[PDB]
Design a protein around this ligand. Sequence first.
Ligand SMILES: CC(C)[C@H](Nc1ncnc2[nH]c(-c3cn[nH]c3)cc12)c1ccc2c(c1)S(=O)(=O)CCC2
Length: 169
Amino acid sequence: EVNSFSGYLKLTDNVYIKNADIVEEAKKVKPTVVVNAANVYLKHGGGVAGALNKATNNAMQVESDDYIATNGPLKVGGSCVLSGHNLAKHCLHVVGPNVNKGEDIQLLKSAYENFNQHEVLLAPLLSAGIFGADPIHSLRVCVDTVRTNVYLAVFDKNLYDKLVSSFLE
Ligand SMILES: CC(C)[C@H](Nc1ncnc2[nH]c(-c3cn[nH]c3)cc12)c1ccc2c(c1)S(=O)(=O)CCC2
């Protein structure tokens, strides 16, 4: 019943990967921590963040606005811990660089370093999709940076297959 991840492929001693929607994984597993692919103002307008917010019936967005009002925006490469709502005990909101908006890809290492404060995490592939990072590079940074136990859900079988073949070269 605790962190019941199923059907993952173990890549390294601490990195696992599955072709799955992170929202569906969070509902089934109810992990201790789910990672959001956030932006600095925690505006969950689309993609992974919009999907996680919609699964909380907008409770994540209201909580996020209150956090920003009191604390100000996050930095690129930084994170904050807020409620997991019905998806997890906690949501770790992590800001990976948006290369399509000119942010430095080197900050992807700092973004993955936030994962090391949590023993077990369900997470998306940071800075992939419309953030513009090369998803094979993002997996290599994950493997080289994260030391705690991370379960990556990648919602695209074509990309999943390319990432596993890239890792097993
Ligand atoms: C690479 C892609 C396959 C992957 N997507 C996903 N990966 C895992 N669980 C997912 N659920 C949905 C979904 C459910 N309902 N609606 C959307 C998407 C999703 C991905 C990973 C990272 C990032 C993005 C996208 S982005 O374009 O949202 C920008 C932020 C970084």
